[PDB]
Design an enzyme around this catalytic site. Structure first.
Site, PDB file in Angstrom:
ATOM      1  N   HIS A 201      55.427  78.039 -11.949  1.00 41.37           N
ATOM      2  CA  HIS A 201      55.153  76.731 -11.310  1.00 41.37           C
ATOM      3  C   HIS A 201      55.457  75.504 -12.160  1.00 41.37           C
ATOM      4  CE1 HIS A 201      51.467  78.837 -12.711  1.00 41.37           C
ATOM      5  NE2 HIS A 201      51.155  77.684 -13.283  1.00 41.37           N
TER       6      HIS A 201
ATOM      7  N   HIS B 262      52.686  70.704 -20.107  1.00 41.79           N
ATOM      8  CA  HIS B 262      53.623  71.104 -19.040  1.00 41.79           C
ATOM      9  C   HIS B 262      54.079  69.922 -18.228  1.00 41.79           C
ATOM     10  CE1 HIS B 262      49.651  71.274 -17.156  1.00 41.79           C
ATOM     11  NE2 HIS B 262      50.297  70.810 -16.110  1.00 41.79           N
TER      12      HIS B 262
ATOM     13  N   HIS C 243      55.711  68.291 -14.224  1.00 39.14           N
ATOM     14  CA  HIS C 243      55.938  68.305 -12.786  1.00 39.14           C
ATOM     15  C   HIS C 243      57.119  67.379 -12.592  1.00 39.14           C
ATOM     16  CE1 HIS C 243      51.862  69.951 -12.021  1.00 39.14           C
ATOM     17  NE2 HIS C 243      51.591  69.301 -13.130  1.00 39.14           N
TER      18      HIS C 243
ATOM     19  N   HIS D 296      51.923  66.569 -18.543  1.00 39.54           N
ATOM     20  CA  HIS D 296      50.496  66.764 -18.744  1.00 39.54           C
ATOM     21  C   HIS D 296      50.215  67.518 -20.023  1.00 39.54           C
ATOM     22  CE1 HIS D 296      49.792  66.409 -14.149  1.00 39.54           C
ATOM     23  NE2 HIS D 296      49.822  65.229 -14.743  1.00 39.54           N
TER      24      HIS D 296
ATOM     25  N   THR E  47      45.255  69.924 -10.885  1.00 37.15           N
ATOM     26  CA  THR E  47      46.181  69.738  -9.761  1.00 37.15           C
ATOM     27  C   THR E  47      46.824  71.023  -9.225  1.00 37.15           C
ATOM     28  OG1 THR E  47      48.130  69.169 -11.143  1.00 37.15           O
ATOM     29  CG2 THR E  47      46.675  67.344 -10.439  1.00 37.15           C
ATOM     30  N   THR E  48      46.593  72.150  -9.904  1.00 35.08           N
ATOM     31  CA  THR E  48      46.931  73.464  -9.339  1.00 35.08           C
ATOM     32  C   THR E  48      45.666  74.310  -9.206  1.00 35.08           C
ATOM     33  OG1 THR E  48      47.548  74.400 -11.481  1.00 35.08           O
ATOM     34  CG2 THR E  48      49.292  73.329 -10.191  1.00 35.08           C
TER      35      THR E  48
HETATM   36  C1  LIG Z   1      45.128  79.140 -16.721  1.00 37.82           C
HETATM   37  C2  LIG Z   1      44.750  77.687 -16.939  1.00 37.82           C
HETATM   38  O1  LIG Z   1      44.284  77.120 -15.710  1.00 37.82           O
HETATM   39  C3  LIG Z   1      44.728  75.925 -15.196  1.00 37.82           C
HETATM   40  C4  LIG Z   1      44.712  75.810 -13.804  1.00 37.82           C
HETATM   41  C5  LIG Z   1      45.124  74.641 -13.189  1.00 37.82           C
HETATM   42  C6  LIG Z   1      45.576  73.558 -13.940  1.00 37.82           C
HETATM   43  N1  LIG Z   1      46.042  72.335 -13.614  1.00 37.82           N
HETATM   44  C7  LIG Z   1      46.374  71.614 -14.709  1.00 37.82           C
HETATM   45  S1  LIG Z   1      46.956  70.061 -14.534  1.00 37.82           S
HETATM   46  N2  LIG Z   1      48.180  70.137 -13.522  1.00 37.82           N
HETATM   47  O2  LIG Z   1      47.213  69.476 -15.819  1.00 37.82           O
HETATM   48  O3  LIG Z   1      45.995  69.252 -13.837  1.00 37.82           O
HETATM   49  S2  LIG Z   1      46.140  72.361 -16.270  1.00 37.82           S
HETATM   50  C8  LIG Z   1      45.607  73.694 -15.397  1.00 37.82           C
HETATM   51  C9  LIG Z   1      45.170  74.867 -15.993  1.00 37.82           C
HETATM   52 ZN   LIG Z   2      49.924  69.414 -14.446  1.00 38.93          ZN
END
Ligand SMILES: CCOc1ccc2nc(S(N)(=O)=O)sc2c1
Ligand SMILES: [Zn+2]
Length: 259
Positions: free
Chosen positions: A70, A97, A99, A122, A200-201
């Protein structure tokens, strides 16, 4: 959980069913969610939001980077930390990471006054807690990326690595680089917006203290396109990785503040 979570583009580009964002499970349907639109002129200056202190950000490292299906993710492994920034504790860096899209006016998760940027990066950190989870367990630093003609030398190690991890589950090692290489000049990071929200995921946990810096990273158009050109969502490489972006969520009764 009738199928795996996905972004809208994946549902639209493949016949294999998946749960699009509006159908996500977890905490993803609650009411303190991210991303948001930020009306910059409506965010109040809070004087307690002073400068950040970055540790381990200037240090040249050879980071591991991977395609997790993703996004592309750098493993930071506590090798860096932050404090200040109106944060109530030091936070340790876990991962970075991104987007993105392939058109300059979309790709960011957050918007500033209704403008999306070409990517959003992020950097995910975890709170150093005292003895007695909270709404601010995780601190994500968000940098907007503006498309242009300026080649960002700082990004080249990352962008070159992308060709080695086209499919999910693949890792590579980046050429020597620091985190500051990827960010704007530190003196331009004094202006940022702050609010409380979610991941956000999925599972979209409402435990994030968000920072969106005003100052964009400048990346060349084709350094941005390198992301969608070299990466795929799937091992079959049927869907190029782009529009890995959660749609906008309602602010509700939350307040956004700024430095
Ligand atoms: C395995 C680790 O779990 C997660 C799950 C969702 C998630 N979303 C973000 S973000 N898009 O920066 O808001 S960091 C993150 C870490
Ligand atoms: Zn993110």
């Amino acid at each position: 959980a009738e199928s795996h979570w996905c972004y809208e583009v994946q549902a639209e580009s493949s016949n294999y069913p998946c749960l699009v964002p509006v159908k996500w499970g977890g905490n993803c349907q609650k009411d303190r969610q991210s991303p948001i639109n930020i009306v910059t002129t409506k965010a109040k200056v809070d004087k307690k939001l002073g400068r950040f202190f970055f540790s381990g950000y200037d240090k040249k490292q050879t980071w591991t980077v991977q395609n997790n299906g993703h996004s592309v993710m750098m493993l930071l492994e506590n090798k860096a930390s932050i404090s200040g920034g109106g944060l109530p504790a030091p936070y340790q860096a876990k991962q970075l990471h991104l987007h993105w899209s392939d058109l300059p006016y979309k790709g960011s998760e957050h918007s500033l006054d209704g403008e999306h940027f070409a990517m959003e990066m992020h950097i995910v950190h975890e709170k150093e807690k005292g003895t007695s989870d909270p709404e601010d367990e995780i601190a994500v630093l968000a940098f907007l990326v503006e498309a242009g003609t300026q080649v960002n030398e700082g990004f080249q190690p990352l962008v070159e690595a992308l060709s080695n991890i086209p499919k999910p589950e693949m890792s590579t090692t980046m050429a020597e680089s620091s985190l500051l290489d990827l960010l704007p000049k530190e003196e331009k990071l004094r202006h940022y917006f702050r609010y409380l929200g979610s991941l956000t995921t999925p599972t979209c946990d409402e435990k994030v203290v968000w920072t969106v810096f005003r100052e964009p990273i400048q990346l060349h158009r084709e350094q941005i396109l390198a992301f969608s050109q070299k990466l795929y969502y799937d091992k079959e490489q049927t869907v190029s990785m782009k529009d890995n972006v959660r749609p906008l969520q309602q602010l509700g009764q939350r307040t956004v503040i700024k430095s």
